[PDB]
Amino acid sequence: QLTAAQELMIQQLVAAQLQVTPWPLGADPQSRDARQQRFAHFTELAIISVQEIVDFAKQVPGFLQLGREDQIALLKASTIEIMLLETARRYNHETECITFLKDFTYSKDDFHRAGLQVEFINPIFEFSRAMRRLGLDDAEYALLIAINIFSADRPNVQEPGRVEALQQPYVEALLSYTRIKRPQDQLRFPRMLMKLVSLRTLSSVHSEQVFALRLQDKKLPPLLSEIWDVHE
Numbered sequence: 001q002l003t004a005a006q007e008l009m010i011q012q013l014v015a016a017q018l019q020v021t022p023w024p025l026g027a028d029p030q031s032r033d034a035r036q037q038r039f040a041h042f043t044e045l046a047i048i049s050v051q052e053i054v055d056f057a058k059q060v061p062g063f064l065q066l067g068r069e070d071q072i073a074l075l076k077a078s079t080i081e082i083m084l085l086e087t088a089r090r091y092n093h094e095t096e097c098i099t100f101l102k103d104f105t106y107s108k109d110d111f112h113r114a115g116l117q118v119e120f121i122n123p124i125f126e127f128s129r130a131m132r133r134l135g136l137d138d139a140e141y142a143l144l145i146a147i148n149i150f151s152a153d154r155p156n157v158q159e160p161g162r163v164e165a166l167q168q169p170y171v172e173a174l175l176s177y178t179r180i181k182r183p184q185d186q187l188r189f190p191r192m193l194m195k196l197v198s199l200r201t202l203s204s205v206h207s208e209q210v211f212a213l214r215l216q217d218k219k220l221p222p223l224l225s226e227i228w229d230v231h232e
């Protein structure tokens with residue numbers, strides 16, 4: 001059985017989880033004006049998502065007690081990975097579109113028309129399509145977010161000991177949870193850790209997509225730029 005502490009920590013995350021430039025209509029796929037506007041649109045959706053991630057992290061117990069520089073370091077690293085997880089969760093399997101809201105849904109072709117390369121687009125969609133087999137519930141997703149946030153090995157983490165100590169109870173709860181819910185499925189926890197490694201890969205692919213965009217004279221807005229731009 002889940003302990004009182006584990007029930008509590010999960011409830012807290014599950015509760016915490018609870019709480020734009022228009023697409024250019026009918027513009028040529030090749031239009032440089034329109035590719036820029038399609039890009040700007042994604043950019044603004046991304047900014048909404050990061051604010052959500054910040055506001056979530058702030059509610060996770062212990063996060064706000066970390067030094068200010070660790071808070072930023074953890075958030076800089078996990079932002080895109082949490083975004084990708086959330087993208088997977090909302091992904092429409094019938095229509096093959098990542099779903100931001102209700103009528104805000106995007107296919108591989110929509111991303112390609114925004115200037116993105118199939119090298120980035122194909123993986124994000126395969127990751128989303130693949131997550132369904134896992135069949136994660138709300139408690140499992142939230143646990144995964146929290147464990148992603150408290151990764152002691154991110155660039156520029158100054159108190160990784162503290163960070164790992166915060167992560168541990170969440171890893172323990174997730175293991176217990178999958179064991180209780182799917183006792184016959186011994187590969188389930190490994191499957192979850194596998195998604196955590198794919199998220200690292202995808203995060204790197206995203207970073208290169210960002211750089212590639214800069215080479216096409218496409219610049220992120222200041223908020224995203226501070227998270228994702230390379231600079232020497």
Ligand SMILES: O=S(=O)(c1ccccc1)N(CC(F)(F)F)c1ccc(C(O)(C(F)(F)F)C(F)(F)F)cc1
Pocket residue numbers: 039041042043045046049083084087098100106116124206209210213220224
């Ligand atoms: O799901 S996203 O976060 C997303 C962003 C905006 C609108 C819908 C969906 N996303 C795809 C991913 F699968 F990676 F999560 C995504 C994130 C970031 C980007 C970009 O960083 C930017 F600039 F658009 F925000 C970039 F296009 F550069 F890659 C693009 C798509």
